Every structure is written in C-alpha cells, then in structure tokens.
C-alpha cells in the first residue's frame, strides 16, 4: 500500500553526483593509465558487472586504488563514469568505438547495448 | 506522489 | 547531445538497495532509541538536509554511530530509511504522525509535503 | 533510451 515519489531516484542521483564534484566522500580512485578518476565504489558496484565483482572480493573491496587494464581509454571511462552518474551517455562518432570496449570491460550491457545499435545504423 |  | 537511459537512476537505487540489505560498504549506523540502523552515509546525504548538514560537517563525517534525537520514533525512521533506498513510503493512519513529525527533523521536504495533504484530507 |  505504499506511495511513490516519481522523482526520487533521479534526486538522489543528482545528488551522489554532486559528491562526486565536490569529492565528498569518495573513497576509490581508478587508474586509467595516465588519468586518475575519483569515486564513491558503491555507486560503481551499482553500474558495473566489474566493479560489483571486484568490491565484493574480501581483499579488494579495501583498496583505495584500482588499475584497470592498459587497454582501456581514459576518455571512454570518463564519458562512462559520467553516465553511471548522471543517466547520460555522450556517445559520438569519434568515441563510440572506446565508449562501446570500456562498457564491454565494465559489463555496462544497456550501454553496450545501444553502442552495437549505434554502429549498425552507421554500417 | 503516485500509486505505484 | 547526449542521450539518456530512462531507467538508469531507479536501478542505481535498487542496487544501492540490495547494498544495505546484504550490509555491504555501509558506513555509519544511526541510532534511534533502542533500535540501530545501518546505512551509508552518501545515501543519507542526497535524501536528507539533516544528514547532509551532519556529514559535511568536518567531525561529524568521521563518526560511524550517529544518535538521532530521543524524541524520533524508530518506526517513523524506518519507514523514512526504506523510502530513501526505494522511493516507497509506506504512509498510513497509524504512522502519519511519527512519519511526518521524523521528515519534519530529517528535512525531507517531499515527505512532509505529502503527509501535510494526507492529514488535511482526514480533518 | 532517449534523446533527454
Ligand atoms: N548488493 C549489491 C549490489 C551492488 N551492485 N549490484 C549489482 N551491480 C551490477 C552487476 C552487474 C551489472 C550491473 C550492475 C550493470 C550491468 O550491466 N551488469 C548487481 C547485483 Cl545483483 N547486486 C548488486
Ligand atoms: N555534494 C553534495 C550533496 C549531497 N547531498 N546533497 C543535498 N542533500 C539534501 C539537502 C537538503 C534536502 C535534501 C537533500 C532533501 C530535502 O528535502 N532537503 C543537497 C545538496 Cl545541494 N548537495 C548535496
Ligand atoms: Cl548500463
Ligand atoms: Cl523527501
């Protein structure tokens, strides 16, 4: 019998983001090769098939810092931690490609999902 | 608020 | 230009949901009379003024045991925690009163909004 | 998805 609030999720993510910003309690940092990503690991888990493995592991769920394989592109994870954010995804033609491998890497499905629909528009 |  | 994943922010929620439930990377425990809650602190930030005042707070963040006000009903606040994990609050005759006088000291404006109509409709 |  319970009530709903429409717009609460989106409020709370606003909000997790907002943290994110200001880095408030941000208790992670992700290595992607040259770059440095700061993040709560919560809100990781809760957007990626990887990061939800790793953070349940009972010897990395303590790290402070994760490296992620060489491969991946600092712009792609960018524009992917972004999204896991904010629920936006800012896909183009010159990232698609990066974007669609990074979200592969993370198991990010929806997104890897309309990256492949993306691509076969194109071909 | 909405009946969900 | 970006695009957006509608779902998004609900199925960050429930994830972050299915972390409280399993006490996984829960970071404080609020004390409500006899009874304990566990939460994490981000969480309680983006859904209530109180808490966001608390955890900016450049002490208050460190704590792990937060003791809410003795006059705050532990039912009141359960229902106020479920809602800020699920959207869902589960407002009725016998608990309107504790939920909204709780929202009232959390500053959950939106609740307090709803539980004003609510009792406004029954006088 | 949707164009926001
Ligand atoms: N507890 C918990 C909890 C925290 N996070 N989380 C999940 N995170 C996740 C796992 C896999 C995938 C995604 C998110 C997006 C995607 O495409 N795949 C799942 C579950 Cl079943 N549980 C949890
Ligand atoms: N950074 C940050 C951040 C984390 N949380 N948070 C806010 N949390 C909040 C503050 C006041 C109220 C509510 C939530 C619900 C309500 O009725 N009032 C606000 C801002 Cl402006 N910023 C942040
Ligand atoms: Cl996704
Ligand atoms: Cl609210």
């Given at each position: 019998?319970?009530?709903?609030?429409?717009?609460?999720?989106?409020?709370?993510?606003?909000?997790?983001?907002?943290?994110?910003?200001?880095?408030?309690?941000?208790?992670?940092?992700?290595?992607?090769?040259?770059?440095?990503?700061?993040?709560?690991?919560?809100?990781?888990?809760?957007?990626?098939?990887?990061?939800?493995?790793?953070?349940?592991?009972?010897?990395?769920?303590?790290?402070?810092?994760?490296?992620?394989?060489?491969?991946?592109?600092?712009?792609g994870?960018?524009?992917?931690?972004?999204?896991?954010?904010?629920?936006?995804?800012?896909?183009?033609?010159?990232?698609?490609?990066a974007?669609?491998?990074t979200?592969?890497?993370?198991?990010?499905?929806?997104?890897?999902?309309?990256?492949?629909?993306?691509?076969?528009?194109?071909? | 608020?909405?009946?969900?």
């Open positions: 019998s319970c009530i709903q609030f429409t717009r609460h999720a989106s409020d709370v993510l606003l909000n997790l983001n907002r943290l994110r910003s200001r880095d408030i309690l941000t208790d992670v940092v992700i290595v992607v090769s040259r770059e440095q990503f700061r993040a709560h690991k919560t809100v990781l888990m809760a957007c990626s098939g990887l990061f939800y493995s790793i953070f349940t592991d009972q010897l990395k769920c303590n790290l402070s810092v994760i490296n992620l394989d060489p491969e991946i592109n600092p712009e994870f960018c524009i992917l931690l972004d999204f896991m954010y904010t629920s936006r995804l800012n896909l183009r033609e010159g990232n698609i490609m974007v669609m491998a979200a592969m890497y993370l198991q990010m499905e929806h997104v890897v999902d309309t990256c492949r629909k993306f691509i076969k528009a194109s071909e | 608020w909405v009946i969900p």
